Amino acid sequence: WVIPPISCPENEKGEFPKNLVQIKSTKVFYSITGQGADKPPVGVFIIERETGWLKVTQPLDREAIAKYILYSHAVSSNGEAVADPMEIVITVTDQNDNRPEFTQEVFEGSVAEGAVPGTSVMKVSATDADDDVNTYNAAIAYTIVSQDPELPHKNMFTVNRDTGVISVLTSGLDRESYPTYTLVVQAADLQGEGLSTTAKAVITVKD
Amino acid sequence: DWVIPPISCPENEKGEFPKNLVQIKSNRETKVFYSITGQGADKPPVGVFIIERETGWLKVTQPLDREAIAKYILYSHAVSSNGEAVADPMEIVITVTDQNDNRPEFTQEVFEGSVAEGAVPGTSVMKVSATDADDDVNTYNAAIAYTIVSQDPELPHKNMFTVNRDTGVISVLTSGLDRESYPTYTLVVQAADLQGEGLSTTAKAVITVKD
Ligand SMILES: [Ca+2]
Ligand SMILES: [Ca+2]
Ligand SMILES: [Ca+2]
Ligand SMILES: [Ca+2]
Ligand SMILES: [Ca+2]
Ligand SMILES: [Ca+2]
């Protein structure tokens, strides 16, 4: 045989089917087997019997299947396999089509009112379904969007953009005055420059 | 003949470099040395692509940028240890595939428009436009949807105007324009790719109410 590495981007558009590669091996008839061919999901990839042109029949979702393993078969017209089945690996390449997702809707934390600026309070966390191995499409930066109340100061807390750890930023926390803060926290991919989602951190001020 | 399949590589890849692409081969029989020529190999940008001289493994050495170069045209060479080419150079085409790494940008910071006060709801006012440097032929990464983010003043109500999400045409949505109370509106308009769901930017549309 001879089998090149094969790639298809997810979320393609336009006319289908789309040509991938021509598989070459008495007239020969080409077949593919495997999950994605004759097994679920059935018919995502096909091959032309006579030409050996391997094709994709629909847009792909990498977050469903990121890698397909198929086998090509070559059968003469008289009915004999003229070659061993050849392993074909198709790599589905990533597009940034998933926003980060916070693991909780409302994270809860507490802080001692006398805690010095720079004191760690709590941690927020988010996942991103996109390709964190080969891309930055899942590279999350955390930021604080808003603080309620805006008292005594507007920015009482800060979040570490890599780790999602929230710390005391400035002085002035006081249980008697404002016992609770609701922060809107954001997670944004492409290292903060990309798609984003929000959630809340509720911080209660202790003695 | 040579054997050369389609080669593609996504832009903006991270991780360890270099990365394997495909193995280049010829059926010839002495010890063969492989090499590559072209822009991206031995010509500017030099060394983006390299080949292992004895194995024929073609590799990329760094992240690519489709908006700089979307397609490379290289040639592979096969030379015996005695110094004679043992095949004719083979064209190798490398397609750089798109990532959504460009946010849309409006063609102006402030678009200016104007509307007669008694214009019936549904009347076209002005147009906003944005472009996107990503691949609009093959992806949704440059597929812009227009929306109105905000209207100032919010009087006599909000939603005085609307925007066609495909065309950027701003029209009168509801009645109530009154130049002697609210002489102008500043709309914050957004263009967002992936059909409205993706990367976004904002601009202003300032509308002067005529009589
Ligand atoms: Ca997907
Ligand atoms: Ca993502
Ligand atoms: Ca994806
Ligand atoms: Ca780019
Ligand atoms: Ca874009
Ligand atoms: Ca791009």
Curated annotation (Swiss-Prot), chain A:
Sample GO molecular function, one term: calcium ion binding
Location of this chain's protein in the cell: Cell junction, Adherens junction; Cell membrane; Endosome; Golgi apparatus, trans-Golgi network
Domain notes: Three calcium ions are usually bound at the interface of each cadherin domain and strengthen the connections, imparting a strong curvature to the full-length ectodomain.
PTM characteristics: During apoptosis or with calcium influx, cleaved by a membrane-bound metalloproteinase (ADAM10), PS1/gamma-secretase and caspase-3. Processing by the metalloproteinase, induced by calcium influx, causes disruption of cell-cell adhesion and the subsequent release of beta-catenin into the cytoplasm. The residual membrane-tethered cleavage product is rapidly degraded via an intracellular proteolytic pathway. Cleavage by caspase-3 releases the cytoplasmic tail resulting in disintegration of the actin microfilament system. O-glycosylated. O-manosylated by TMTC1, TMTC2, TMTC3 or TMTC4.
The keyword Lipoprotein belongs to this UniProt entry's keyword annotation: no
Outcome of substituting Q58E: Increased affinity for L.monocytogenes InlA. Greatly increased affinity
Biological processes per GO annotation: actin cytoskeleton organization; bicellular tight junction assembly; calcium-dependent cell-cell adhesion via plasma membrane cell adhesion molecules; canonical Wnt signaling pathway; cell-cell adhesion; cell-cell adhesion mediated by cadherin; cellular response to amino acid stimulus; cochlea development
Binding annotation for Ca(2+) 1: D97
Domain Cadherin: 1-102, 103-207
Binding site for Ca(2+) 2: D97
Glycan-modified residues: S120, S125, T198
Gene: Cdh1
First-to-last residue of the parent protein present: 158 to 369 of 884
Record note on quaternary structure: Homodimer; disulfide-linked. Component of an E-cadherin/ catenin adhesion complex composed of at least E-cadherin/CDH1, beta-catenin/CTNNB1 or gamma-catenin/JUP, and potentially alpha-catenin/CTNNA1; the complex is located to adherens junctions. Found in a complex composed of CDH1, RAP1A and PKP3; PKP3 acts as a scaffold protein within the complex, the complex is required for CDH1 localization to mature desmosome cell junctions. Interacts with the TRPV4 and CTNNB1 complex. Interacts with CTNND1.
Record-listed Ca(2+) 3 binding positions: D128
Coiled-coil spans in chain: none
The protein, known as: Cadherin-1
Keywords per UniProt: Calcium, Cell adhesion, Cell junction, Cell membrane, Cleavage on pair of basic residues, Cytoplasm, Disulfide bond, Endosome, Glycoprotein, Golgi apparatus, Membrane, Metal-binding, Phosphoprotein, Repeat, Signal, Transmembrane, Transmembrane helix, Ubl conjugation
